[PDB]
Amino acid sequence: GPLSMSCWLREQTLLLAEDYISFCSGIQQTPPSESAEAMRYLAKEMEQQHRTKFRSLSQEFLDTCGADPSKCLQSVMRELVGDGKMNWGRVVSIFTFTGVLASELLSRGEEGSRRLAETIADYLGGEKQDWLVENGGWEGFCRFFHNA
């Protein structure tokens, strides 16, 4: 139905990804939601824990997949998740990577964000719909943050 569960999750994911991309692209606003406060903290924390690997994958991605960043990104996301139990940590890694892309892009030029956020929303809100719901939605992410 209109604004079903999948729709609400997709929209929420989309705007969370638009926030983090903005956050990494030199924009400074208070977090628009609790989930955004959580992601900004956890995604940047994960970046510092692996800065060279994310920066290296990001540069390679930009230098290889300029033709269509979206379809490469879909593959990257699948490989970030891998074959094991999915978890909020894996989800965070998706945001981290895309935020590093966004910042490296701005150091070089400028706006693929619109493309990137939708691609994230389609993958998590669409493909991984079942895991997201099973794990409480973005509310469950906020709980994961308030105990991490």
Author numbering: 1 to 110, 113 to 150
Reported in the publication:
NRZ is a 19 kDa protein expressed in the epiboly of the extra-maternal yolk syncytial layer (YSL) of zebrafish eggs. In vivo, NRZ has been shown to be a potent inhibitor of apoptosis after serum withdrawal, and controls development during somatogenesis and gastrulation. Similar to other pro-survival Bcl-2 proteins, NRZ adopts a conserved Bcl-2-like fold consisting of eight α-helices that form a globular helical bundle. Our findings suggest that NRZ is a unique pro-survival Bcl-2 protein with an unusual pro-apoptotic Bcl-2 binding profile unlike its counterparts in mammalian systems.
To determine the structural basis of NRZ interaction with BH3 motifs of pro-apoptotic Bcl-2 proteins, we determined the crystal structures of apo-NRZ and its complexed holo form bound to the BH3-motif of zBad. Surprisingly, our structural search and comparison using DALI48 revealed that the closest structural homolog of NRZ is in fact Mcl-155 with an R.M.S.D value of 1.7 Å over 136 Cα atoms, and a sequence identity of 15%. In summary, like other pro-survival Bcl-2 protein structures solved to-date, NRZ adopts a Bcl-2 like fold and its most closely related structural homologs are the cellular apoptosis inhibitor Mcl-1 and the canarypox viral Bcl-2 protein CNP058. Comparison of the backbone structures of NRZ and NRZ: zBad BH3 complex. a Cartoon representation of apo NRZ (light blue) superimposed onto NRZ: zBad BH3 complex (green). Here we examined the structure and interactions of NRZ by determining the structures of apo-NRZ and its complex with zBad BH3, the orthologue of mammalian Bad and measuring the binding affinities for BH3-motifs. The structures revealed the conformational changes in NRZ after binding of BH3 motif ligand and provide a structural basis for NRZ mediated apoptosis inhibition.
